[PDB]
């Protein structure tokens, strides 16, 4: 045989490069996944992740209460969370002076949000409804457009010059930063075959039932990077502006 890494007869080499290229290109086909992640950062350094994976379109919608530390995974809060005092905190966030809490500031409120989409999203389709604490997009229902198109604010997460994902990050450092949150994106479709046309619309309806959700709170950004992002070949941007993910297109 020819010698490895010296000719066009390195079939092991050509097959490795096609295997990676096929994964990149399948994800971008109308048969592939589109994915969204919401990360909520708490003052104790822990991070809640909500992930949704689906064909054609994908999104996540959470209340003010559901984004607070210990709502999901309350069994981790035993001796650190006063669940009753946190009910009173909620009454004082819904209406000024409406509750009887024993804290000025709940350490369970998120300090920041990162939204990440898979590289299979079309960024011009991204929509976000960032509501007040009683789930109203813009002050009163009567004057609310139900979303903002925020694609222009998304940064490219890059590895080896390939786009591996898209990031929108915003801090909630002020006492008045009390939010509900929904986000939504559509899978790329550079074709003129509308996946929602009469021929395929019931498959999009089935995609709504088939979407898979994941929810977990990690104790540290390091634990998130090591045991969630890296093992699953997911894109990520850390507090130091360091990019994570795997470049696949035309690569060994
Ligand atoms: Cl296709």
From Swiss-Prot:
Record InterPro entries: Cypo_polyhedrin_Cypovirus1
Biological source species: Bombyx mori cytoplasmic polyhedrosis virus
Signal peptide: 1-26
Entry protein name: Polyhedrin
Additional facts recorded: The sequence of strain H is shown.
A Pfam family it matches: Cypo_polyhedrin
Subcellular location: Host cytoplasm
Keywords from the named record: Glycoprotein, Host cytoplasm, Late protein, Signal, Viral occlusion body
Keyword set includes Signal: yes
Keyword Transmembrane helix attached: no
GO cellular component: host cell cytoplasm; viral occlusion body
Glycosylation sites: 27, 81, 90, 241
Primary role: Major component of the virus occlusion bodies, which are large proteinaceous structures (polyhedra), that protect the virus from the outside environment for extended periods until they are ingested by insect larvae.
């Amino acid at each position: 045989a020819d010698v490895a890494g010296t000719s066009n007869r390195d079939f092991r080499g050509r097959e490795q490069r096609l295997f990676n290229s096929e994964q990149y290109n399948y994800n971008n086909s109308l048969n592939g996944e589109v994915s969204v992640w919401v990360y909520a950062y708490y003052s104790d350094g822990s991070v809640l992740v909500i992930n949704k994976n689906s064909q054609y379109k994908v999104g996540i919608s959470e209340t003010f209460k559901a984004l607070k530390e210990y709502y999901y995974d309350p069994e981790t809060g035993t001796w650190y969370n006063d669940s009753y005092d946190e009910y009173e905190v909620n009454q004082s966030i819904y209406y000024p002076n409406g509750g009887d809490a024993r804290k000025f500031h709940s350490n369970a409120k998120p300090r920041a949000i990162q939204i990440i989409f898979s590289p299979s999203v079309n960024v011009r389709t991204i929509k976000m409804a960032k509501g007040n604490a009683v789930s109203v997009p813009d002050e009163y229902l009567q004057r609310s457009h139900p979303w903002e198109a925020t694609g222009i604010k998304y940064r490219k997460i890059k590895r080896d010059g390939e786009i591996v994902g898209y990031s929108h990050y915003f801090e909630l450092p002020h006492e008045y930063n009390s939010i509900s949150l929904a986000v939504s994106g559509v899978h790329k479709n550079p074709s003129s075959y509308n996946v929602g046309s009469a021929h395929n619309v019931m498959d999009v309806f089935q995609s709504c039932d088939l979407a898979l959700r994941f929810c977990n709170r990690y104790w540290a950004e390091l634990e998130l990077v090591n045991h969630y992002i890296s093992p699953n070949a997911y894109p990520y941007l850390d507090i130091n502006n360091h990019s994570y993910g795997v470049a696949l297109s035309n690569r060994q």
